[PDB]
Design a protein around this motif. Sequence first.
Motif, PDB file in Angstrom:
ATOM      1  N   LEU B  13       0.825  -1.204   0.000  1.00 34.18           N
ATOM      2  CA  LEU B  13       0.000   0.000   0.000  1.00 34.18           C
ATOM      3  C   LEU B  13       0.861   1.257   0.000  1.00 34.18           C
ATOM      4  O   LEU B  13       0.548   2.234  -0.691  1.00 34.18           O
ATOM      5  N   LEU B  14       1.946   1.255   0.778  1.00 31.31           N
ATOM      6  CA  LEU B  14       2.866   2.388   0.766  1.00 31.31           C
ATOM      7  C   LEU B  14       3.538   2.537  -0.593  1.00 31.31           C
ATOM      8  O   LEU B  14       3.674   3.653  -1.109  1.00 31.31           O
ATOM      9  N   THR B  15       3.960   1.422  -1.192  1.00 31.64           N
ATOM     10  CA  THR B  15       4.615   1.449  -2.494  1.00 31.64           C
ATOM     11  C   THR B  15       3.657   1.769  -3.632  1.00 31.64           C
ATOM     12  O   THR B  15       4.119   2.010  -4.753  1.00 31.64           O
ATOM     13  N   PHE B  16       2.345   1.764  -3.379  1.00 36.37           N
ATOM     14  CA  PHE B  16       1.395   2.168  -4.411  1.00 36.37           C
ATOM     15  C   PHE B  16       1.661   3.597  -4.870  1.00 36.37           C
ATOM     16  O   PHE B  16       1.525   3.910  -6.058  1.00 36.37           O
ATOM     17  N   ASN B  17       2.038   4.473  -3.946  1.00 37.00           N
ATOM     18  CA  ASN B  17       2.450   5.823  -4.309  1.00 37.00           C
ATOM     19  C   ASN B  17       3.868   5.786  -4.865  1.00 37.00           C
ATOM     20  O   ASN B  17       4.769   5.266  -4.197  1.00 37.00           O
ATOM     21  N   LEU B  24      11.448   4.281  -0.431  1.00 36.10           N
ATOM     22  CA  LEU B  24      11.721   3.015   0.238  1.00 36.10           C
ATOM     23  C   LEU B  24      12.693   2.141  -0.544  1.00 36.10           C
ATOM     24  O   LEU B  24      13.306   1.243   0.044  1.00 36.10           O
ATOM     25  N   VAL B  25      12.840   2.376  -1.850  1.00 33.33           N
ATOM     26  CA  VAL B  25      13.782   1.591  -2.646  1.00 33.33           C
ATOM     27  C   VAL B  25      15.208   1.822  -2.159  1.00 33.33           C
ATOM     28  O   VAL B  25      15.991   0.878  -2.003  1.00 33.33           O
ATOM     29  N   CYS B  58       8.022  -1.515  -6.689  1.00 29.03           N
ATOM     30  CA  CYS B  58       9.328  -0.870  -6.602  1.00 29.03           C
ATOM     31  C   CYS B  58       9.944  -0.684  -7.984  1.00 29.03           C
ATOM     32  O   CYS B  58      10.561   0.350  -8.263  1.00 29.03           O
ATOM     33  N   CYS B  59       9.789  -1.676  -8.859  1.00 23.47           N
ATOM     34  CA  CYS B  59      10.314  -1.619 -10.216  1.00 23.47           C
ATOM     35  C   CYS B  59       9.298  -1.079 -11.216  1.00 23.47           C
ATOM     36  O   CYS B  59       9.580  -1.061 -12.419  1.00 23.47           O
ATOM     37  N   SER B  60       8.130  -0.646 -10.750  1.00 20.09           N
ATOM     38  CA  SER B  60       7.112  -0.116 -11.645  1.00 20.09           C
ATOM     39  C   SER B  60       7.573   1.194 -12.275  1.00 20.09           C
ATOM     40  O   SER B  60       8.325   1.968 -11.676  1.00 20.09           O
ATOM     41  N   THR B  61       7.107   1.436 -13.503  1.00 19.55           N
ATOM     42  CA  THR B  61       7.494   2.636 -14.235  1.00 19.55           C
ATOM     43  C   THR B  61       7.031   3.916 -13.549  1.00 19.55           C
ATOM     44  O   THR B  61       7.609   4.979 -13.798  1.00 19.55           O
TER      45      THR B  61
END
Lengths: 45, 236
Positions: B13-17, B24-25, B58-61
């Motif tokens: 949920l945090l990584t959704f933003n 975080l990466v 994390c690896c999302s564009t």
Amino acid sequence: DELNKMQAFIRKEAEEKAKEIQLKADQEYEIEKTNIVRNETNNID
Amino acid sequence: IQLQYHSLLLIWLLTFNPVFANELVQKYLSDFLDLLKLVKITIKEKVSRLCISIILQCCSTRVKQHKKVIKQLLLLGNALPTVQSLSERKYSDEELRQDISNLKEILENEYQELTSFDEYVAELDSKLLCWSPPHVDNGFWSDNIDEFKKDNYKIFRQLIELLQAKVRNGDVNAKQEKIIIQVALNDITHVVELLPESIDVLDKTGGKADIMELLNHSDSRVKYEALKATQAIIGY
């Protein structure tokens, strides 16, 4: 160690070959230098 | 298990933003590797799907430096091999299977641009070497000899520094430390046999002293590697 001593002799033998090759090059240089002097003799003549 | 699942859901949920995912990466470089290991170990479909979604986010564009993050993850945590293993394995959940397939495709695309040189550079930067295929590959060493000596032998200097650090860490003589020391010694021997100009740089940087110190190491493998390096240096 025995392995180190064996490797030392092989490297030392290669050193003698390198010195012999270098000595042969010095002899060739003297022969080439004489040829250069001989070539210059024709130009000087 | 419930706590781990809740933590994974919160992380996703945090990584959704994208901003939070990018932040975080860099917070934990080994977070992706830990998540992949947990997903592989855990058999729960929901936990595996959550871990896959978190890894993809994390690896999302959308996240900044998506290509760089994906390349770093593939080079460090071996994302491509883990994704390939997961794809071969059968998952009951359809959504988890689709997420695993997408992650495998992303990892393959990232590794297509990358090469063995990038993996070697990442391993040198992380100071971790466990006898990689490139170390034992004669062709890789032959085709990377010029790269190692490039930039005033920057790679050779880095390898010498790693060997010196391992010698300093040789007091612990850990199994991983011993393997890293042996790999560094093999790399130094290769870089001395090929491109002999690097031998003078290694001698100036104390590489010969490090090899001599490693020759007295208690470990049999480390001593053998140091003896082989010494033989490649001045020996037969």
